Amino acid sequence: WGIGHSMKEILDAHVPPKGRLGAGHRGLFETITDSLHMQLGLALASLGVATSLVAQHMYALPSYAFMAKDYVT
Amino acid sequence: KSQALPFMDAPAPLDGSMAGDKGFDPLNLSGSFDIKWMREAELKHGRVCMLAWVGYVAVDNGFYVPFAPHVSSLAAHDAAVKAGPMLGLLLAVGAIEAISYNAIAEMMSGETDRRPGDFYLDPFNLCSTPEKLESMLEKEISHCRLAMFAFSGVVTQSALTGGAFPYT
Amino acid sequence: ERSASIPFLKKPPALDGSMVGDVGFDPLGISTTIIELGGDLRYVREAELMHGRQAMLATVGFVFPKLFGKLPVDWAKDISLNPLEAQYQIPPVALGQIAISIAIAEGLRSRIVFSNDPDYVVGDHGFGAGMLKGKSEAQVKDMKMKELAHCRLAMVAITGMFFQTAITGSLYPLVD
Amino acid sequence: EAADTWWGDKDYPPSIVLGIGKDVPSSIFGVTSGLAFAIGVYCVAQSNLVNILSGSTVNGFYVAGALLVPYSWGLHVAAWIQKQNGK
Ligand code: CLA
Ligand SMILES: CCCCCC(=O)OC\C(C=C=C1C(C)(C)C[C@H](OC(C)=O)C[C@@]1(C)O)=C/C=C/C(C)=C/C=C/C=C(C)/C=C/C=C(\C)C(=O)C[C@@]12O[C@]1(C)C[C@@H](O)CC2(C)C
Ligand SMILES: CCCCCC(=O)OC\C(C=C=C1C(C)(C)C[C@H](OC(C)=O)C[C@@]1(C)O)=C/C=C/C(C)=C/C=C/C=C(C)/C=C/C=C(\C)C(=O)C[C@@]12O[C@]1(C)C[C@@H](O)CC2(C)C
Ligand code: KC2
Ligand SMILES: CC1=C(C#C/C(C)=C/C=C/C(C)=C/C=C/C=C(C)/C=C/C=C(C)/C=C/[C@@]23O[C@]2(C)C[C@@H](O)CC3(C)C)C(C)(C)C[C@H](O)C1
Numbered sequence A: 001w002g003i004g005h006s007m008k009e010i011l012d013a014h015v016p017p018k019g020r021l022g023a024g025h026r027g028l029f030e031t032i033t034d035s036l037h038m039q040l041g042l043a044l045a046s047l048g049v050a051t052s053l054v055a056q057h058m059y060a061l062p063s064y065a066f067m068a069k070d071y072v073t
Numbered sequence B: 001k002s003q004a005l006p007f008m009d010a011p012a013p014l015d016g017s018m019a020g021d022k023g024f025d026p027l028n029l030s031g032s033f034d035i036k037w038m039r040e041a042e043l044k045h046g047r048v049c050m051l052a053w054v055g056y057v058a059v060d061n062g063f064y065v066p067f068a069p070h071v072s073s074l075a076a077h078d079a080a081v082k083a084g085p086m087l088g089l090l091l092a093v094g095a096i097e098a099i100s101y102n103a104i105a106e107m108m109s110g111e112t113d114r115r116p117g118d119f120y121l122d123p124f125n126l127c128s129t130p131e132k133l134e135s136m137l138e139k140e141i142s143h144c145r146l147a148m149f150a151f152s153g154v155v156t157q158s159a160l161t162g163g164a165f166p167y168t
Numbered sequence C: 001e002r003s004a005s006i007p008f009l010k011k012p013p014a015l016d017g018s019m020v021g022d023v024g025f026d027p028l029g030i031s032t033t034i035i036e037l038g039g040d041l042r043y044v045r046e047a048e049l050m051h052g053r054q055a056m057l058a059t060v061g062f063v064f065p066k067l068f069g070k071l072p073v074d075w076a077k078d079i080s081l082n083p084l085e086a087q088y089q090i091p092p093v094a095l096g097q098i099a100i101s102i103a104i105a106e107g108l109r110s111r112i113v114f115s116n117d118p119d120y121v122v123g124d125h126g127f128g129a130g131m132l133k134g135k136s137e138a139q140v141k142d143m144k145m146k147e148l149a150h151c152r153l154a155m156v157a158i159t160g161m162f163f164q165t166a167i168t169g170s171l172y173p174l175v176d
Numbered sequence D: 001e002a003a004d005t006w007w008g009d010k011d012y013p014p015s016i017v018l019g020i021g022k023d024v025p026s027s028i029f030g031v032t033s034g035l036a037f038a039i040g041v042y043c044v045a046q047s048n049l050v051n052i053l054s055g056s057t058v059n060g061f062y063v064a065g066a067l068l069v070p071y072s073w074g075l076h077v078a079a080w081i082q083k084q085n086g087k
Helices: A007-013 A028-034 A036-060 B035-059 B072-085 B085-108 B128-160 C043-066 C093-114 C137-167 D015-021 D026-045 D060-066 D068-084
Strands: none
Touching: A007 A028, A028 A036, B035 B072, B035 B085, B035 B128, B072 B085, B072 C137, C043 C137, D015 D068, D026 D060, D026 D068, D060 D068
């Protein structure tokens, strides 16, 4: 419906002005879509951060009633 | 070459051919953004203002439908929201505006030659010849511009005064 | 170019005619995203057809127990009004037969639909053939168009009936 | 597909990076950037000058105006982009 971003243009635009990061993120859109190993690697990295976060926050801030007293769960 | 502001020339060349063109755009928003969206918004605002002025007058006179507790048009909004059918009217308007989402999205980016605010709700062929279409477009847009001020004044006078039909 | 239903919208490129009820009504473009997957419109037409047929049988079944009466057999102490609340008083020793009959019918229909065969006219299950012999293509097309119109009307109708009896007490012009 | 948006061989991005606002001149962008920044800072200051309460003092207009502070960042960046482009 016309509105919205194109992910290719966002990646191709993000080049620092004078060669600080090389050619920027040009060509990253074609590599990610055509490689299922890069998408899967990003997914596993994010999910690993997420489940470590749930490990920290479920003992730090318990949400289920009458836990933090069983101690074994 | 501007008409309304004779010390200027054409606030971008966007103002060259459409109906109701008087060169009046001092803040250059005609050239900053695409003018089809502006004309769609203008026509849509004017049509809303026309029906809103017609409804605000008629409810303030005594035209009341079955049920619909007889209250002035100032409190009719709250009375009918507490009654309920305002939500159904909102749902119907939302369906029409989903179709309007589709229409405006098709109009702006190629693949459809729709005029801004066009639709095709023309049962009686009052715009068959192009000259009749131009005349009716001029009358429509002039009525839009007049009815915006008309309904704005009606609402403001009804809100600040106690309330009558001529609004003092 | 432009659709025959919504005149200010573009014509759906998948809905190019040659099908019953093709008035070019697809603002979301469901059929556009079905054929670019390499599929066709046989399955969605079959779904619409039996949705409408169940809708017609439903429209008769909402109104029949209260407008006319119940079965002469026993155990019919279910509420005459509120069919949606009369679902839960059905004894299991009738639900078993209902479920078995629908199960075998839909197993046969699943064998028909999901097979592969290209000679299968959509909706032509073979149950109804006693009246279409000796008819031209125009008569069959008109008959299928009447079926599709009744399908869509009955689906809108049953949505109305279910949303009326659940919020309001009952249907206004016929009940209570 | 899309448009050639890469500008690694130029000192400024092209005007097409602004999308729907690719034709707005730089002066409008800068004036709206200053106005949006001022209004947004005022709206977020109405949450610490006055203690925001549980429902009593929330004032959703100040919430909607609070989104102008990140919007003011994008407007002054787009002002620079249009200025280098000559628009
Ligand atoms: C007087 C104001 C006015 C004028 C001159 C026009 C003129 C035009 N409109 Mg338009 N329109 C108006 C108001 C007006 N409109 C309003 C208020 C709405 C909102 C509903 C619309 C919605 C609208 C749509 C959706 C479409 C048009 C179209 C058109 C064009 C062809 C139709 C035509 O000849 O209409 C001539 C108009 C008249 C002779 C006016 C008759 C006066 C009526 C009878 C008054 C009725 C008031 C009544 C109380 C309202 C009840 C509300 C209730 C039923 C909901 C033409 C340029 C069509 C178009 O551009 O396609 C080519 C099109 O698709 N208009
Ligand atoms: C056992 C055989 C099958 C029997 C079942 C049956 O029925 O047959 C199927 C059949 C054809 C057939 C065949 C037979 C010839 C019969 C037998 C053949 O078999 C052989 C071997 O020959 C098979 C077949 C298929 O060829 C034909 C049946 C057609 C049928 C049953 C069509 C009903 C539409 C209802 C509608 C549109 C409701 C609208 C309701 C509307 C529009 C409303 O507005 C209602 C509502 O306003 C109300 C009233 C009040 C409001 O408050 C609420 C609302 C607003 C909602
Ligand atoms: C009317 C005012 C007049 C003065 C202002 C002004 O116009 O100057 C404009 C100007 C310079 C200039 C001019 C030109 C345009 C070049 C030319 C002009 O001449 C013409 C017309 O050509 C003259 C001149 C000097 O004006 C420069 C503008 C610079 C500007 C506007 C810089 C904004 C940064 C924003 C940031 C860093 C946001 C951080 C935002 C943050 C950190 C957040 O969002 C936090 C957040 O919690 C928030 C707050 C809300 C939450 O929801 C979201 C979260 C939680 C994330
Ligand atoms: C989205 C779901 C939905 C659909 C698809 C749908 C379709 C139709 C159709 C077309 C087939 C017709 C012809 C029709 C007609 C009437 N409907 Mg709908 N209707 C739906 C929902 C509701 C709800 C929630 C209510 C309601 C009612 C009425 C009344 C009563 C007016 C009166 O009493 O005079 C009448 C005449 C109200 C009612 O039950 O009585 C208060 C009520 O609350 N309807 N309705
Ligand atoms: C097509 C299209 C669109 C669309 C659409 C729409 C509106 C689609 C709607 C489809 C719809 C509405 C499909 C209903 C099915 C309901 C059925 C089959 C109910 C059967 C009901 C049964 C079998 C009930 C039987 C009962 O026995 C029970 C349970 C108890 C008894 O006491 C009473 C009775 C006998 C009654 C978009 C999205 C608008 C745009 C897009 O681009 C194109």
